[PDB]
């Protein structure tokens, strides 16, 4: 439609030259072929939806730009996204619950790293579905998940992308560890499980970096012993740290954008919900927002 093209031309359309290959601004002729075949198989299959260069991309690099495996993933998260309802959870789902459970399960977006990434914050560690599950349900917090990735490509990385000055596709994530117990991991690991299934199968190409924090100490020897036999991309993507991150974070995200608890410089009103209820960020900033309007 019309509306799409103002939004994809309200912001910066290019990753920087020194990004991954294969993504938008940085295509080689055999890659651009492959866009333009891929997206000619799916216009004939009916698709009108979700055919920019960026989303087609990421299904691409996710197949190794093998296009008949790129359509079929295509075709499986468009099925997905018509029977779980995600075109219309940003106006069907209200997770009222999120004052009286987000202290169970903290995950809030904040400001953004050094590449312009949202920062996600997960505190795992802090996990208490016991108390969660008197209030909401695991159903429910799957499409609180769905809401917010939702939210994070139709408002926050445009906005991220205005104020980085370029393209900005995917997320930094920042999860916690502290306080985490084999009782309470086996707890959560369903929802880790589904969640995982969703980001991979229906947000390819959505993780930019991965930090885990306050690793127990058996977890983070397993990655120091078998990071040799990790893949160099792999390897600039996840990092698995204990209880001395905060150096290694702030090599990735500004001082005064990292939470003071994580040592930054960072602040929120903790009289008026804290991190665990903000979502600060370029997206609430005017001179960032464009024609979508401001996140909900
Ligand atoms: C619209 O896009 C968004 O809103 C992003 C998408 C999301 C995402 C996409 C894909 C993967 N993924 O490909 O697996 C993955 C994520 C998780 C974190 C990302 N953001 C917090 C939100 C982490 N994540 C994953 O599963 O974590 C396990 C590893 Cl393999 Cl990193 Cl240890």
Known sequence: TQQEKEFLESYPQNCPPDALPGTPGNLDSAQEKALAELRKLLEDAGFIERLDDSTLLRFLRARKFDVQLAKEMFENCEKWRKDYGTDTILQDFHYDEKPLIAKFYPQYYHKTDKDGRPVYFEELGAVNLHE???????????????????????????????????????????????????????????YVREASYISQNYYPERMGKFYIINAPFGFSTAFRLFKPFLDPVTVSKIFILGSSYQKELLKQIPAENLPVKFGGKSEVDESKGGLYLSDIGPWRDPKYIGPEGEAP
Request: with cysteine; charged share 20%.
């Open 132 to 190: 969660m599950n008197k209030v909401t349900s695991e159903e429910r917090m799957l499409k609180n998940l769905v809401w917010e990735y939702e939210s994070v490509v139709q408002y926050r990385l445009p906005a991220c992308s205005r104020a980085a000055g370029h393209l900005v596709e995917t997320s930094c994530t920042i999860m916690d560890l502290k306080g985490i117990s084999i009782s309470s991991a086996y707890s959560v690991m369903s």
